[PDB]
Design a protein around this ligand. Structure first.
Ligand SMILES: OC[C@H]1O[C@@H](O[C@H]2[C@H](O)[C@@H](O)[C@H](O)O[C@@H]2CO)[C@H](O)[C@@H](O)[C@H]1O
Ligand SMILES: OC[C@H]1O[C@@H](O[C@H]2[C@H](O)[C@@H](O)[C@H](O)O[C@@H]2CO)[C@H](O)[C@@H](O)[C@H]1O
Length: 129
């Protein structure tokens, strides 16, 4: 079946999880960007816990600590490519237990995305559209 990916939209910023310049390259760090219908803002949940983009790329935690980059890499089944959306709006990395976090409490276009200790601040709350 089709992916049917949807947005991951930040509550504090009103902006969407976005792969810069619609790049598909491994290791590309994510950012906030104005929400649009483009495929670089479409994130498809799977039963394996992934958030997929471009069919076979995965939202990817480069590490397990505060400030570790959130990026894309080809999907391969790693626990650092597994994510859970919680009732408090947090998107938590399964491996690390850390939250998707807009760096520095930034809201603007280009604000980078990292892992960070969960605080439930508005830069850590998300909706799926
Ligand atoms: O990174 C900012 C922004 O990039 C857009 O991609 C542009 C790209 O920057 C430009 O060089 C090219 O000519 O057109 C692309 C499509 O507009 C993304 O579309 C946007 O989502 C952001 O990711
Ligand atoms: O890892 C960065 C961290 O930034 C926090 O925001 C802080 C920022 O670090 C500080 O320079 C500024 O004076 O206060 C901000 C809080 O209002 C975020 O809260 C946190 O989630 C991380 O993004």
């Amino acid at each position: 079946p089709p992916a049917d990916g949807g947005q991951i939209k930040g509550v504090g910023s009103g902006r969407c999880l976005d792969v810069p310049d619609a790049s598909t390259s491994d290791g590309t760090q994510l950012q906030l960007w104005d929400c649009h219908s483009g495929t670089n803002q479409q994130w498809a949940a799977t039963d394996a816990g992934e958030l997929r983009v471009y069919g076979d790329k995965c939202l990817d935690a480069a590490g397990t600590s505060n400030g570790s980059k959130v990026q894309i890499y080809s999907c391969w089944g790693g626990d650092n490519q597994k994510w859970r959306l919680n009732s408090d709006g947090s998107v938590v990395g399964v491996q690390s237990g850390l939250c998707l976090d807009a760096v520095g409490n930034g809201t603007a276009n280009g604000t980078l995305i990292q892992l960070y200790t969960c605080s439930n601040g508005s830069n850590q709350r998300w909706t799926r559209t």
